[PDB]
Structure 1
Amino acid sequence: EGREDPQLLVRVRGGQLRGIRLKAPGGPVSAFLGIPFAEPPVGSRRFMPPEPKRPWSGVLDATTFQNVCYQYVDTLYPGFEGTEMWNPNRELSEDCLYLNVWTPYPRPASPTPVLIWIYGGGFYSGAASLDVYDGRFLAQVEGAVLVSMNYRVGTFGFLALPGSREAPGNVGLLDQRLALQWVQENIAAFGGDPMSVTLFGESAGAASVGMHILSLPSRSLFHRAVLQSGTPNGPWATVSAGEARRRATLLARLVGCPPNDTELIACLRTRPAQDLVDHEWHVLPQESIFRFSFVPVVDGDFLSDTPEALINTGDFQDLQVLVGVVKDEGSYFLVYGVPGFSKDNESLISRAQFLAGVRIGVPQASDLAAEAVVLHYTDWLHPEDPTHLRDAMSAVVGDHNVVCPVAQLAGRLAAQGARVYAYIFEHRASTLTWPLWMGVPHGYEIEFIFGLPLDPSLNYTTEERIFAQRLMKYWTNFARTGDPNDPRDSKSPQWPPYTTAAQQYVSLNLKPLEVRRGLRAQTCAFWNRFLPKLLSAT
């Protein structure tokens, strides 16, 4: 110390850090990357709840992103930006419990609202180090303090033998909770306001945010929440204790650890990380899409009951939530698992391929339930039209997994005292490499919220730059006040809260805010009210 930039030296509970001065389009930002928030969850600590990071000596170098949690790397389309933008961009390691902080440069004078990002990737993948999660634009343009953490995914984060002490499950959610506790204790050192913390996430990250709303020890660590294209309720975000036990026992057998829980988990702990990753997909009970093997478990601890029970009986009076979906939630999910679909052709499918797709897309559905889906989604005026069947297949997967769980969440939260704001993101990035038929796929609003179009080198349009700026203002005004609307602006139309009566939501596209009523009201009544009765009475 002495010749360094005095504005990049900060102390936290565990010791001294040295950050880096990053260039954002409009000026510098301070970034503290790869801060350890936990003891590496390696060896005997595998499958175990995280432990806080013991203090270190000297100045920890926080200028680069740290290891990405051990996960399956997507090699389906080599060289393809469409798939590779989501791939790990740092070394894979079980030693991965690190977080990143972006703040204005110089650090804020007065306490600043904090935004905490929780990434998606079906609870089997993802990293806080990805380019689309770059906090520099929100920090520079909006003066925000942005935090993102790495949390354990796959078997490492969610393999559970419920009731055991060695593998209790939900440890990836505990890693997220420990980063939330780290923020409470240390964010003031960066100029962050611990009394104004907004959680935001997409897909499995939004489901994670939802589970922090539904778990009491997490409630004291944040004040507001954003759930983008994901919810704690729904068919993929959780599993029962029985199903988690079945999947963990099957994976153990597949890697030569046959079953006492102590003996089984000890053997799993001896397995190389790649062995567990090589078999993680082999434990799913059916041929399915939008289903992940190791996800949060209804343990009766982190989740005292199913998210459906918790959202229906909870008092959400003290909560402000921003929720929404993209135009084509299911389109991407069709390219791996449904025969007839490809990113390289127009995916015009037959009726037979549609019926078959419905079985893969709704794996838990009986023959009667699958017929009810088919009959509801068929255009009886053009029942064999390949374009309609292709679009219906995308809608089945999007509605079942995202849109209707989101409508169910917004509805219950609003009925139970929360301030809810809902949107539909309909803008397709001019730079998108997925086919046009895929529309606005799952995750393609993220680069807009984070302000990536503000970087001139990324080649987005001027209109896309103005729209990203509008979006950053909605998200940060929501983080600041619990309302996305700017108080010093009446010209711009307003975003009304979502209510059970009016069911108002807004369209997020290049045009000004447009207020719409009912988020697939008829279709989601099918999924949320009828279909459970068909998967119950018969």
Structure 2
Amino acid sequence: EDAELLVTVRGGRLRGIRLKTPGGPVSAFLGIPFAEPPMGPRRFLPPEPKQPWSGVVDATTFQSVCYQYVDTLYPGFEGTEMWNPNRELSEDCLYLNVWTPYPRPTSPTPVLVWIYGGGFYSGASSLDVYDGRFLVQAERTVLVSMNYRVGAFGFLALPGSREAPGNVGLLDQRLALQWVQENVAAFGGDPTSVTLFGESAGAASVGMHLLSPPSRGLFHRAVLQSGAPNGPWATVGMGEARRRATQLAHLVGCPPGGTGGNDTELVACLRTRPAQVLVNHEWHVLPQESVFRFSFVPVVDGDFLSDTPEALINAGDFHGLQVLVGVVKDEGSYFLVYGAPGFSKDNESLISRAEFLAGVRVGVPQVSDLAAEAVVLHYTDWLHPEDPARLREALSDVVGDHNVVCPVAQLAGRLAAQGARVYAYVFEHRASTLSWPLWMGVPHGYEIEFIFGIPLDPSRNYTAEEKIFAQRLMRYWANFARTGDPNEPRDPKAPQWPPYTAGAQQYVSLDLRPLEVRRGLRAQACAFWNRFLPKLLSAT
């Protein structure tokens, strides 16, 4: 009843809201504070737990979005603005949301925790495509999603100093995980069956938590969608993070005039600046000749990450852990319209040979000219080295393999070979309502709406097949959250999803057709990135 919309947690009382789905109602608790507002002197600091409150906190609507850059490449366009903030920006943003079935579960229920992506510079738990009402109604699981500080506010780092240690955006997620341990039982959720799942930078975050011992105790399973902590964009060195942080200070006038520039005076100067001012110079801090490179990302400090993600994945024991990994068919196409020459969402992006050669330097930055030739002469079809359509898909493969598919395949192989049960997929269905052009195929990010069951929304023009497809995927994700195995615990009639192993390298394709097993997550291309290219880079 209306009594199930009232819940007490360790910090105080909450009033939720009843959400409707075509299959029945759901109880949602949107906007639960899990940390003290990280403002004024607490900007750039690790989060402090929210102190208990008197009265009833209203938990009926999403709270503020953390301060972030707002994408303006295509104003008024659905394909880009669906990721933009849909609540007002504020540094007061450390809130989490909880969906729970109606009636509330009597017995402890497995908990899904969502970590949004957005390159560590954007994103929000309030986005329409992260609506948890459909996954909770159809699979009677408990869904939690948190906000975490992005951009400079979450990942500006002057390593060594205590005024700006870095990775505070990861600590925000960790605190939200500690909050789930201490309070998800009150919503009917099992704190012993917690399944993290994220996408892009959210998936990378999930991977960073697997490799951080303090976070490792707060969950039991992991799902990484189109991202990995070992990606070339997901981390940064201490020296580069200090250079970026210092350059941002310079751009906003820090330190003032002629004055000392130790870490303490620099952060104090940064704390006096309005939040929007720091955001307005976020992209100017990089060399600014890049697609896929982000200014403030997790730093390898020796604290949250004792070593690089690659090192920790190799030297890591993963027995007793189940992972679900995967990518979309066309991982790189969405990013090409963000700086690759000759590309535009409003034409066919039939690029020339010279544009392809320049795009490789944009999509694979920082590498040497000989390394670029290895990429070009490996992704060229030499029977059609000038076909524009093939060059377009080649560059899309170049930036997709280098940034997503091969970092993911590298990780999935090391996990399976080191004792973790791993299941791998490739998402190959292009939504019928997709607004991006046809040549992008199944772009990065556009499986999320099917995992969250958005096709079930009656106010959307999804086909009957996509509705059944969405229910199928929700069953896969929920079964993995419940049992660690996406396969039906009692249904062998439907095609089976074999584990992924370093040898067989099996995965399944997710589309309207029944499950189909394949071998190799682009094994040929990924051997070039994972094996040959590092040996080639030790020429300088």
TM range (shorter): over 0.9
User: Residue 284 of structure 1: CA displacement?
Assistant: 1.3
The aligned amino acid for 2:154 is: G
Secondary structure at 1:525 match in 2 = helix
The one-character-per-residue Cα deviations of 1:447-481 (angstroms, maximum 9, x if unpaired) are 00000111122110001001000000000000001
Counterpart position of 1:203: 200
Contact between 1:30 and 1:102, CA under 8 Å: does it hold in 2? yes
CA–CA distance in structure 1, aligned partners of residues 104 and 477 of structure 2: 21
User: Residue 245 of structure 1: CA displacement?
Assistant: 0.6
Secondary structure at 1:390 match in 2 = helix
Counterpart position of 1:68: 65
Q: CA RMSD in A?
A: 0.8
The aligned amino acid for 2:340 is: V
Counterpart position of 2:488: 486
Counterpart position of 2:356: 354
Counterpart position of 2:174: 177
The aligned amino acid for 1:240 is: G
Secondary structure at 1:44 match in 2 = helix
Counterpart position of 1:400: 402
Counterpart position of 2:26: 29
CA–CA distance in structure 2, aligned partners of residues 291 and 395 of structure 1: 17
Counterpart position of 2:224: 227
Contact between 1:123 and 1:294, CA under 8 Å: does it hold in 2? yes
Secondary structure at 2:290 match in 1 = coil
CA–CA distance in structure 2, aligned partners of residues 13 and 531 of structure 1: 52
Secondary structure at 1:382 match in 2 = coil
The one-character-per-residue Cα deviations of 1:165-207 (angstroms, maximum 9, x if unpaired) are 0100000000000000000000000000000000000000000
User: Residue 340 of structure 1: CA displacement?
Assistant: 0.3
Q: Note the 1:183-332 alignment, pairs <5 A.
A: 183-258=180-255, 259-332=261-334
Counterpart position of 2:85: 88
Counterpart position of 1:473: 475
User: Residue 537 of structure 1: CA displacement?
Assistant: 3.4
Secondary structure at 1:528 match in 2 = helix
Counterpart position of 1:162: 159
Counterpart position of 2:515: 513
User: Residue 25 of structure 1: CA displacement?
Assistant: 1.4
The one-character-per-residue Cα deviations of 1:289-345 (angstroms, maximum 9, x if unpaired) are 111000000010000000000001000012100000000111011101111000000
The aligned amino acid for 1:194 is: P
Secondary structure at 2:342 match in 1 = coil
The answer to whether 1:106 aligns with 2:103 is yes
Task: Using the aligned pairs only, state the percent identity.
Answer: 88
Secondary structure at 2:281 match in 1 = helix
The aligned amino acid for 2:222 is: A
Counterpart position of 1:372: 374
Contact between 1:104 and 1:139, CA under 8 Å: does it hold in 2? yes
CA–CA distance in structure 2, aligned partners of residues 107 and 91 of structure 1: 31
Query: Which runs of 5 or more residues in structure 2 are unaligned?
Result: 256-260
Counterpart position of 1:382: 384
The aligned amino acid for 1:518 is: G
Contact between 1:119 and 1:205, CA under 8 Å: does it hold in 2? yes
CA–CA distance in structure 2, aligned partners of residues 537 and 342 of structure 1: 36
Secondary structure at 1:332 match in 2 = helix
User: Residue 286 of structure 1: CA displacement?
Assistant: 4.9
Secondary structure at 2:518 match in 1 = strand
The one-character-per-residue Cα deviations of 1:378-417 (angstroms, maximum 9, x if unpaired) are 0000001100111101100100000000110011101111
CA–CA distance in structure 2, aligned partners of residues 344 and 101 of structure 1: 39
CA–CA distance in structure 2, aligned partners of residues 364 and 513 of structure 1: 39
Contact between 1:33 and 1:100, CA under 8 Å: does it hold in 2? yes
User: Residue 24 of structure 1: CA displacement?
Assistant: 1.1
The one-character-per-residue Cα deviations of 1:194-246 (angstroms, maximum 9, x if unpaired) are 00000000000000000000000001100000000000002000001111011
The answer to whether 1:451 aligns with 2:443 is no
Q: Which moved more, 1:270-279 or 1:282-291?
A: 282-291
The aligned amino acid for 1:402 is: V
Secondary structure at 2:459 match in 1 = helix
Counterpart position of 2:37: 40
Q: Which moved more, 1:280-289 or 1:407-416?
A: 280-289
Counterpart position of 2:258: none
Secondary structure at 2:47 match in 1 = coil
The one-character-per-residue Cα deviations of 1:113-136 (angstroms, maximum 9, x if unpaired) are 000000000000000000110010
CA–CA distance in structure 2, aligned partners of residues 95 and 286 of structure 1: 30
The aligned amino acid for 1:169 is: G
Counterpart position of 1:419: 421
The one-character-per-residue Cα deviations of 1:93-141 (angstroms, maximum 9, x if unpaired) are 0000000000001211110000000000000000000011001001111
The aligned amino acid for 2:475 is: K
CA–CA distance in structure 1, aligned partners of residues 119 and 273 of structure 2: 23
The one-character-per-residue Cα deviations of 1:425-455 (angstroms, maximum 9, x if unpaired) are 0000000010000100010000000001111
The aligned amino acid for 1:32 is: F
Q: Note the 1:146-161 alignment, pairs <5 A.
A: 146-161=143-158
The one-character-per-residue Cα deviations of 1:70-103 (angstroms, maximum 9, x if unpaired) are 0011122111101111110101000000000000
Counterpart position of 2:412: 410
CA–CA distance in structure 1, aligned partners of residues 340 and 4 of structure 2: 53
The aligned amino acid for 1:56 is: W
CA–CA distance in structure 2, aligned partners of residues 234 and 537 of structure 1: 22
CA–CA distance in structure 1, aligned partners of residues 174 and 452 of structure 2: 23
User: Residue 285 of structure 1: CA displacement?
Assistant: 3.1
CA–CA distance in structure 2, aligned partners of residues 466 and 497 of structure 1: 24
The answer to whether 1:139 aligns with 2:141 is no
Counterpart position of 2:115: 118
Q: Note the 1:526-537 alignment, pairs <5 A.
A: 526-537=528-539
Contact between 1:286 and 1:363, CA under 8 Å: does it hold in 2? no
CA–CA distance in structure 2, aligned partners of residues 216 and 159 of structure 1: 22
Counterpart position of 1:523: 525
CA–CA distance in structure 2, aligned partners of residues 286 and 532 of structure 1: 24
CA–CA distance in structure 2, aligned partners of residues 178 and 263 of structure 1: 28
The aligned amino acid for 1:183 is: V
CA–CA distance in structure 2, aligned partners of residues 334 and 31 of structure 1: 38
CA–CA distance in structure 2, aligned partners of residues 468 and 523 of structure 1: 30
Q: What number of residue pairs does the alignment pair up? A: 535
CA–CA distance in structure 2, aligned partners of residues 311 and 536 of structure 1: 22
